Symmetry: D2
Subunit: 375 residues, 4 copies
Amino acid sequence: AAFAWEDPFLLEEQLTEDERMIRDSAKAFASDVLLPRVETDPELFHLMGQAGLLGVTLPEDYGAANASYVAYGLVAREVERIDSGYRSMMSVQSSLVMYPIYAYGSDEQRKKYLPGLVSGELIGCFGLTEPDAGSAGMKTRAEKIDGGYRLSGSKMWISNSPIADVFVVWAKSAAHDNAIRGFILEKGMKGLSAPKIGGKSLRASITGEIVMDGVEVSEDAILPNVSGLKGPFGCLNRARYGISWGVLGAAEDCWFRARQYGLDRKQFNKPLAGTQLYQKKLADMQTEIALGIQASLRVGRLFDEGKMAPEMISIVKRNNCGKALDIARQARDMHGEYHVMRHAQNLETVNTYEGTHDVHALILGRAQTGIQAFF
Amino acid sequence: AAFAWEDPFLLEEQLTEDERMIRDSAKAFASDVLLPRVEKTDPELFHLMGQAGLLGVTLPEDYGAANASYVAYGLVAREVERIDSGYRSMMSVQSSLVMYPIYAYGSDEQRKKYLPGLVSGELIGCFGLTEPMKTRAEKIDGGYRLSGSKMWISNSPIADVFVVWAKSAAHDNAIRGFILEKGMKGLSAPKILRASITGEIVMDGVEVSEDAILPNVSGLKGPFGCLNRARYGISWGVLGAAEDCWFRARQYGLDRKQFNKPLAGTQLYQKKLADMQTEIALGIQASLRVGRLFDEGKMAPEMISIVKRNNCGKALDIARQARDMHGGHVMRHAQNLETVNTYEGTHDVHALILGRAQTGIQAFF
Amino acid sequence: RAAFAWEDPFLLEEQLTEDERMIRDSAKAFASDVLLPRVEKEETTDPELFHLMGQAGLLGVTLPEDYGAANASYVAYGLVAREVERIDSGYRSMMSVQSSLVMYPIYAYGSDEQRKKYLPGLVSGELIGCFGLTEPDPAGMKTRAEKIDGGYRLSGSKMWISNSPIADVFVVWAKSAAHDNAIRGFILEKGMKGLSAPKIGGLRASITGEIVMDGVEVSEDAILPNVSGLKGPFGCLNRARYGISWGVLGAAEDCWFRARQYGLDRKQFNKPLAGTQLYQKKLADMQTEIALGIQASLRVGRLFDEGKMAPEMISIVKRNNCGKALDIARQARDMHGEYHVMRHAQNLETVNTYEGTHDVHALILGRAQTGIQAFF
Amino acid sequence: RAAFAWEDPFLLEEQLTEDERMIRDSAKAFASDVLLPRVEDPELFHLMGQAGLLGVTLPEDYGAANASYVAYGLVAREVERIDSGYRSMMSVQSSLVMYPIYAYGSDEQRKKYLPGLVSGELIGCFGLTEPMKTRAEKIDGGYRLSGSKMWISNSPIADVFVVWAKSAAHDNAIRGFILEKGMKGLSAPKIASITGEIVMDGVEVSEDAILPNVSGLKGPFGCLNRARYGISWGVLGAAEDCWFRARQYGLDRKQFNKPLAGTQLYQKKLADMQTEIALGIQASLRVGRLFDEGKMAPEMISIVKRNNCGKALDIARQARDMHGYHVMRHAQNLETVNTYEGTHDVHALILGRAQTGIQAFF
């Protein structure tokens, strides 16, 4: 019976036609547009959007693909296959910016921003973390004023803020009894600045601040349909879901390169991949990627059924980032060449962010036992 | 949203209603019948399993079988090995190594004669392949004469039915399957995990009629199909033992105090619990997918190497980790899984199978 | 090229004194001639084996010749454990208890009267001893010693005590009322009136029990004069753990050698198992980890003799060597895709657990680096 | 009770001689004054040489320190503690160039070349690996060498070239030859150190350019054996640096109002780092002592090179993963170091063959 080593459990037959088509467009884009680059740009967002690869889960009313969370996962996978930096562009734009505008925003808000964000003509950022640390009891405040709000505070380490047109900012809103509310800020607004931050960590990325020096907005700039940490965390959860898929694509790329390198490199008149030690490693890569894909797929399906719980995402994010990083390192060690080293460097960064390996462990730990072990 | 830590990915909602019933049935049996035995080798236990309807669950209702999925076969293995691997081992042999070749490769006569007795558990089978192949079957007037000795055969000393593989001279020395019965002349089966017995199959010119050969299979493909199905069952079964270990380690950690805090309130303990949950959840989705592929008629043996190698390894790691968490049933499971990781076949052999399927080069020698 | 012994990669043999090598050969002869025939035939308590070890001179090797002890180094003590656990952990456990938990405190903390009375019999193995610290509940110890006219009266219950039911000599730790409830050591004997040692319900050559003291009255000379506080018993434990760090290397080596020899004898595809890359890599790890473990235990042994041992050192070798040894026995077990490997592997699981777990020793080391306790 | 130094658990300090401790402290001061500002150049060879850190095991007759192999290791450790590139400079210069000149060379070859290599006024490189095809034809009054070596560390800045070639008339036996920068057929195009080729287009040398006291792979292998030994010591230095950084970082960053290093998970990792580093140090130390006793066997080097490179790389990786600049640098360095001079698996198969008598390479 037929066995596809590159697709052990036949993912291909678990996908809809739309999912396969949308992945194909993602793969063509990655090979034709992303790959030549790897062998930060606002035009690259516009290219991604025009390819229809931004906010794929959003309604056609905004020029989106109206696709499943599974399809979103497939897209991340095809893109991070090229580079995690490119996948990161999509995590921010789609899960951190368009999702909260769509899910928590008004129809006026949906109509103004989403079409521009989907196309990549508008660039967005997500302002939650503040200079203090990872400490949430945030200091950014939104004072109620005649006809709206006045925002004061600083967001720090914000992805794409120095090139953002759209700012989704979380702040304790006076007038909501200090509840955390989401606000949409635009680039030209008075007292709003997004300075870049120094230092070299991923490709195609830029980090900066959001400085709000008494930024005045009307009342329709607040996101009406959400309150509390539930809001930003919903975004983070969806980003992590996409990441759990993306790292599988980079993992695969390392696996395929490790395999091909071992077929191409000869020693004692046989390919390296003709030896047990080498084959054993290829077998472990194949296995872990196959397990990871089935888990993320399952989570995507639950997403679409509306039965996703954030703890599920902790499992696939922690497992897949861990396993993908291990695969990238093993692939690296099997050589001695560049692309495998690049994915590996990327995955070290990816494994760190959006909750560390150990933090997701303790989240799952608390969910099993009812006891928190964070402190 | 609701989260079930014991079923993170909601396996319960991926199963058919038929699958849910058979699992509930398997769960009731393991609890009402198996667990008391282990907590307080038997031909009567076969009859009990058969009477509970848990043997050859994938077989047609024509033989008194459940006519269920390969997924349902896995769920049964999982509920049974949850008590002990020995009880699951009984099923592996009977269902996948004995009933499967008789049904899949056999004639209507052979199906009608043997399967009902095997399904009910009134009849016991064994699988004769491995030797100390040299076993040969000479063509004789009106049938065959079998000579040779099979070794390390599960349940052979208590078996009524013998599925024996032999090079048939009447075919171009090709590997054929033959059904031998306990009362036959040249046939003897000397004895050599819980509820298990191994022995030999000694054939001193055992003469059988022409109706005793399985007509519809030839070559190593025949016995291999049986092993593959047994390995599929095992990949599901070890997850049940894995779960039992995970659940016990969790509960022990809630019950046992150290420094006026439960063990399970500590980071090191929780990380280990998180790993258990993760690997079992990954292993289940994998076995489930392979099971679904079985039913679609799309199983490739290399798929089984993936889930068998992975789930046996990860299940062994979990049982080992759970054992170490009992510092100061888990010992039973942990010891059992060490045996299970070893047989049909080892971790490294399945790795080299996958290695060869990826590269086109065999690395066994 | 230059000579290489795969069986001894770093030439331990040239790091040992002649006396250390002689006592090891002695331990090795005892293990093969007396212990090895036993493991090949289990759940039987046999008090005479203590006498056999003692007569072979393997009990209290670090102790003075005045008691008939070998007056050997702590390195030699380690070598003996290794030669002994190589056969079975239970037999090494006999010596840990007898030498480090019973003879060490009587010798180190006891009077000359106590040294003279108890040590010679314990060295020869005519007396069996046990060590009483742990209670069902070590600072909030409930076992107490009331001051009474002419001595002490001990009452309380010790739990999980090795060899207590076959023991003649009892080293018991208790809160002494007359010493403002400070923890003191007492030597109790088998015949005393309120003393019993019931076996507990449910390793080889090991027997566990309680020490029940129902008002056991002893004279004033039964207390260990030269020690107070937990420093005392903790000092005995540390020496036992040092011995284990060596011992597990013996069981690990036994597994390493059996996995190697099995791979040479068993053929597959008309080639030896040990001719394949995967099998040899496993052999490579065993050799590597055993050789590191030995240099570590040896160094600590040398620091013991210089009087420069610190307990954290022992946490390092005990945790590492128990862990690495268990992994070797497991890998050896799994490579036998049979009886002796399986026996060692089961033993090392228990050994890894007792006398401080892997995680416990990590947090001891963690605390020693950071000054922050992470236990609770 | 007795004192415990978590930074030095088995008291390495008390296992070293006075000379070894002094040479270590001198190496440490050098690395700190000179190397550390750089990580935060042909002249750098001269600086190292003036510090007396090149060819540390060699006789004082060449201006060398005449120290032990333990000291050589200690120096590598202090140097790689800053950066692996700088240790690699010493590995080549000391073990791949000066050693074969000293061990396999004529007295004339020693007197001519060694003082300059010791001082760092001369730079050497080691020519064995190719893209054996390099040959040395017998010619009237000497030899003619033809071929190209690739991935040779420091070849484009080298004054001295130790090249191995199949020498016709020996017959095609591997012999060692000393080549100089100014020579006719010699060119070294480039491809914290620098690699290039050694292109030999019929380079003609006299009969005194051959290393007389060696033949066969024993020659080049003795050199690699010594470099790898140095490496097994050096990576322990990058490893410690990562460990100390991980610890100090865990003490400095608070989370949930407690330092990270106050948690069990963080502490377990520190215990693993501490433990593996202590084991690696005791091993490399034992091997150094065996070198000095003249009892080194190459399989010993396989054990420590493979183990310490593997274990240091894991420590570096774990340290990086714990930083939720210098740790990232070491980690990238150690991955290359674990790759070169024999991979982990090759040393496993080297040890495997020595146990079984069976080769599993093919």
